[PDB]
Structure 1
Amino acid sequence: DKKQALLEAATQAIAQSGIAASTAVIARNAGVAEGTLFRYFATKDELINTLYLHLRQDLWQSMIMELDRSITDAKMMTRFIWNSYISWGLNHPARHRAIRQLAVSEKLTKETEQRADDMFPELRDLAHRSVLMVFMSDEYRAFGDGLXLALAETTMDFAARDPARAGEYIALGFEAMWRALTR
């Protein structure tokens, strides 16, 4: 209740006013005081880190029922995942704008980064089969995610403003992402 009301309030605030979102206004619009929100998340970095995983799991539950592991070709599996992310972002923009801020933020730990891989081995397995090895390194992985989500957000924006041509924007966006970020 109040922990996910905070998680949904943090989503709204971080998507709008950035990750420099006040702990006060995240609390106040979740119908609580600032004191309330810090015994469920010790620090603002702990709120960031589990919201990122919460949003990550929300993206995966939108997809795994439609997910078909028959595909062995990395590019066709990435395309299904790419198509699903864009649709996920179009349906709930705040969840996308928030996860884009959290993914490229310094506050993320590798218990956030190694749980995110354990939570979703299929993506891990896929990344470890196509993505450029430099965008998997601890040093530049966040940058790849930033490139990543920049190409996706641009694809969303043209797909939502020009719905009649959305399908071509998804394909073009995917191909630009694919040759940019894979071997």
Structure 2
Amino acid sequence: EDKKQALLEAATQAIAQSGIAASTAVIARNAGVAEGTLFRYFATKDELINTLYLHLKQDLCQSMIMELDRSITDAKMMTRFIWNSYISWGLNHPARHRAIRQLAVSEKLTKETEQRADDMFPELRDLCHRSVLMVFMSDEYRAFGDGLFLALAETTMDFAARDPARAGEYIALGFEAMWRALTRE
């Protein structure tokens, strides 16, 4: 029923379809509400980008909480579980993936948003006792590394969706491509 969730869902769809340029008028209309109502929730496109990114990240991380087992010590096994979690989430919720990938490479996420993103799920930190995933790049390239992860993830989802009889095969082959590209031992 509640208007914030309706606006966040409408913003998810609109950005998934149109990118960050998506219109607040269209988003407000697709929700129940007047555009003025939308502005009381997010006064700027910049704040909507930041709010929606944290919303989508929270949703993903909660799905990962449901799926992840902590008897796992092996970094590669833990990374595979994370990858499987992300692919499932984007196959279940294609617009949430499409939206988050455009928000992630928008140049509009604030340092406050990054810290709230890094903080929100302590349970998902570390899960490596020191880390393997994308720690080899300079800080300037962390967004680029995230973009490559998302590109490999999106291609894996596309083939698994089109050819579901081999979905697990695409997910495993995509994981090993991601692992080689974005880790070092």
Shorter-chain TM-score range? over 0.9
Provide the identity percentage: 98
Measure the CA separation in 1 of the matches of 2:81 and 2:111. 27
Measure the CA separation in 2 of the matches of 1:116 and 1:28. 29
Instruction: Check conservation: 1:117, 1:123, Cα contact below 8 A.
Output: no
Q: 1:42 Cα shift?
A: 2.2
Q: Could you say what the CA RMSD is over the residues aligned between the two structures, in angstroms?
A: 1.8
Aligned-partner SS, 2:127: helix
Q: 1:112 Cα shift?
A: 1.1
Instruction: Check conservation: 1:135, 1:141, Cα contact below 8 A.
Output: no
Aligned-partner SS, 1:129: coil
Structure 1: which 5+ residue stretches go unaligned?
none
* 2:56 maps to 1:84: no
**Matches for 1:58-77 after TM superposition, within 5 Å:** 58-77=59-78
Q: 1:130 Cα shift?
A: 3.7
Aligned residues: 183
Q: 1:126 Cα shift?
A: 4.9
Measure the CA separation in 2 of the matches of 1:112 and 1:81. 22
Q: 1:128 Cα shift?
A: 8.1
Q: 1:144 Cα shift?
A: 1.0
Structure 2: which 5+ residue stretches go unaligned?
none
Q: 1:124 Cα shift?
A: 4.7
Instruction: Check conservation: 1:130, 1:182, Cα contact below 8 A.
Output: no
Q: Once superposed, which parts of structure 1, at least 4 consecutive aligned residues long, lie more than 6 Å away?
A: none
Aligned-partner SS, 1:133: coil
Change (3 A) 1:127 1:13: farther
Instruction: Check conservation: 1:11, 1:94, Cα contact below 8 A.
Output: yes
Q: TM-score, normalised by structure 2?
A: 0.92
